[PDB]
Structure formats: structure tokens, C-alpha cells
């Protein structure tokens, strides 16, 4: 009597953004990609997946402005000229999530997630819907989503799996861990997806178990050769046992889900050599049309 | 009685890129480079003050080491141990001072710096060269050392500091964070003047002035003249009032407010000459170049000497 899988997309936008319809352009790109891949490789699920926009605030805007004002070329008006300057990308999520206005942003996000969720149910397509619900957040949106998932008894629904697209969340958490050194997402699994060449890329796993510094992130297979996976396991237990050299059960409890968390998307090495100002757009847009990503997600939903 | 008229204490935390414990006989090499530059400039352009200036090392902690390690472990290439291999990935230089000064143990480091600054100051006094010394004292800090020095000055030091010189310090970012965590100024340093010296192409370079008066955004940093072309300065003014008078267009009394709020009578943001090519250099190579450049920079030495004489 309805579709089987709901993706609520928390879209704050490119971290350098300082537009709502555009967000729907992104979501519509992603849905078009979904059905394009689904038709070819997942025909059992064709038209069995729904994607809905949740417009989230650009919490890093103020940080970007401040940091721009502190630049040695702040007085200079030529945008061409400022295209060369070192943008402190890493500082932006720290400043943004250290703002007193941040909690407000999280509350706001929870509110509009609830609104979109209660807009889908009362829609014709979502009438009679009983399926799993997933959250997808872009680089900035992901942070807001995570913090929304940690909060105490207000999401109207239970979230099944959470996906982060090139999110610097790991950095944010690190800061917290430093400020309050003594120290649980409300979801069945977290997927930290990133391109290695992305300056906003941060692992999450070593924050749960430090020894995972020594373990490579799982690879996201390329869609051209392994559309239905490469037969490798995603489960944490199997990774723990391959790396038997440390107990282990002491890691299964803390873990955010039963699967691994850090996932490395394919990316040319050339992108590392790009001008800083140009990288956040490329990466932010890439997710919405990435066949690797949509195929990955589709492989996580068919189970 | 005694010959030195001005004592420079150099707070040397080292290049922001070394997680390793600071060798305190490699810092003295830097200090000795700086002093040699000092005498090189003095002998030609400031002969009145020959042998009347002393430079002494104050070995400061590499407070960003732990942060560097942490952020490296969070790298998508964390499993790779090879430094050559991990010498091309993205170093989040900006995050390092924020994480370092957000530690619940930094204050300890600030305290450490004060203990060793006092110890150096009281090592100079009981030294033959500093016996009977009553002259002015100035602080020089490298990029990280500058942050520690600033925090030491903002409310313990046995002496009064006329001047405070920062070499490519990301201090400005730290303050921004602070100003962000709590928008509740109090961070007025106890010195007669602060000189924020930077190369624009330096990834750690950040202005301080827009934090004191925000539309100093629209006012360029003062330029530090090239020694080869203007060994004695280009005769332009360093006083804040003259800049406020030159820009008056932007203020209307908000002009009197800035004068008292301000750290000293001179401007704070100073731009050293730098090729723009250097902006296109790999980030991993820049902290070394810029940290190294100060100790033998004639621009810097001439500037400082013009502020002391």
C-alpha cells in the first residue's frame, strides 16, 4: 500500500555556501541516479524507494565570514585574487559547532525532519507506508543529523541507517573530546562516506577504538566492476578477526552498528592538488550523481 | 652601569609541524641566527645601539603535537606510517591551534612558559652581561610561541614588557574561536604594543585588527618595507590615529572608542613581503619555509630595531 524505504536528506549545502530549490535539484539528481541504477541492477526494488528534502541551515556561514575577515587579503575586493588564498576549511566546523546558536540549529533540524516526515505520510505516495527510514546528510548536514540523533527523549520516528557524505564530523567530535576529555547515535548503523582527497574527510572509527588508526577504511567498490558488491564483508566482527592482534568483545558494544563505519570512495589522486577554494563544490555535488554511492546504499537497503 | 638597554626574550615552540620533543640546541641555532642578523643590521644602520641589544632563548612546548597526532589518526590514510607517503595528504593546519588551546591542560603549558620566561629573565640578570640591567624588555614569539606568549600576557611575569612581536602566528584564529565559544575586552595584553607580523601566503597568517574593530577588515595591514630598498623604513606612519584619520570615511564617537580599546598606539597587523608563487606551494612545505625565514629576515630585524630605538 506504499513505498518501502524513506530517505530524509539533510541538506545544509556546500560548506563554503554563505537556494532551497537548488537543494531539490540535488535531491532530484540523487533520486534520478537511484532509479537509473535501480532499473539496471536492482529491479526487485524499482519504484520502491523515496527521497525527501530536509533543508538544513548553513551553520558554517558565519565562521566563513569571520575567517575571511581575518585573512591578510581581507581588504582586497577581487574574487579572482582571493581564489588563491588559503581557506582554513578545518576551522569552520569547529567555529560553527562551538557557536551558542548551534543547539538552536540542531533543534531546528529536528523540527524540519519531523515536518518532512509528517508531510510524506500525509502524501498520496506515502499513504500506508510501513518501511524503514534512513537519514542522509551532506558534509555539514551530517553533523546536525548526528547531534540530532544523540539528543534525549525529539525525532518522531526511529531511524534505521545514517549516511554521511564527506562530512568533517570526526573533527567536530575530536574537538569535543578535547574540551571534555572524560567521555550513541539513535540509529542501527552509521556510514561515514568520504573521498580521501576531500579536505573535509574525517574517519570516525579511531574515535571509538584508537587501534583502528592502524586499520584501513573499507573500500567502496566501483560501480562498473562490482555493482552488487565484491563479495567482501562489511561486518565489524570479520574485520576484528582479520586483525586478531587486538578485549575484542570490548569493542562490539560501543560500536555504532554491526558494520564498519569508515568507507573510502574512489577518487583520482589529482584532486589533492586542486586549489582549496574549488574543492568543496566538486565534492559536495559529486555525491548526488555518484553511482558508487547509490549502489552502496541500495546494497544496504535490500538486506 | 650595564651595557644592554633592551632584552629580547624569544618564546620558541618551534615549527608547528614537529610533533617531536623540541630540541633546545636547535632553538638556540635559530636565536643565534636572529642575533647575527641583528648585529649585521645594527653595524650598518643602527651603530648607536651596537652591543646594546641581547637575545635569549625561552624554550616553549610544542603544544600542537598532540593535536597533530590526533588529526593524523583521523586521516583517511591513518594506516600509512611512512612520512613521505603522508607528506602530501591534507594537513588541517588551522585546526591544530584550536584543538591545542582547547585542551583542559593548556593552561599548564601557559604556566610552563611563564616559569621559563621568568627563569630566563632571572638568568640574564645574574649573568655578567645583564648585571645591573634596568632597561626595557620585549617578547618575540614564533607561530605557536606567540599564542603561548599572548596568553601569558593576558593576566605572573617578573618584568614589564614594552613590546611583543609575533612571527606568523595563528593566534588570530584562536581568539576568533574564543570569541565564538563565549561572546561575553578582557583579552587585553599587558604590553605597551603588539606587532602581528606575517607573510600573506603563510597558511597560519591571520589578522588581529578586525577582532578589535571589525571594519578594519577594509583597511589593509601596514606594509613592512624591504630592507634592500628602505633600510630605514619608508617614512610612513605606524600610529593608529593616522590610519583612523586617513580612513575616517568609515566611522561616522566610534573613533575614540577604538583608541582606548586598542592594544597600544601603533597598528597591529604587519604584512611582510612575500612572492605570490609561494601560495601555490604544497602546504606541508610551508611551515618550514616561513618559520625558518624570520630568523634571517632583514625586513623583520630592521622593523624591530626601528621600534626599539
UniProtKB/Swiss-Prot annotation, chain A:
It is found in: Cytoplasm; Golgi apparatus, Golgi stack membrane; Endoplasmic reticulum membrane; Lipid droplet. Residues 155-303 form the DDHD domain. Ubiquitous. Phosphorylated on multiple sites by CDK1 at the onset of mitosis. Phosphorylation facilitates dissociation from the Golgi complex and is required for interaction with PLK1. Phosphorylated on threonine residues upon treatment with oleic acid. Interacts with PIK4CA. Interacts with PTK2B via its C-terminus. Interacts with RHOA. Has higher affinity for the inactive, GDP-bound form of RHOA. The CDK1-phosphorylated form interacts with PLK1. Interacts with VAPB. Belongs to the PtdIns transfer protein family. PI transfer class IIA subfamily. Catalyzes the transfer of phosphatidylinositol (PI) between membranes. Binds PI, phosphatidylcholine (PC) and phosphatidic acid (PA) with the binding affinity order of PI > PA > PC. Regulates RHOA activity, and plays a role in cytoskeleton remodeling. Necessary for normal completion of cytokinesis. Plays a role in maintaining normal diacylglycerol levels in the Golgi apparatus. Necessary for maintaining the normal structure of the endoplasmic reticulum and the Golgi apparatus. Required for protein export from the endoplasmic reticulum and the Golgi. Binds calcium ions. This is Membrane-associated phosphatidylinositol transfer protein 1. The gene is PITPNM1. The chain holds residues 424 to 880 of 1244 of the full protein.
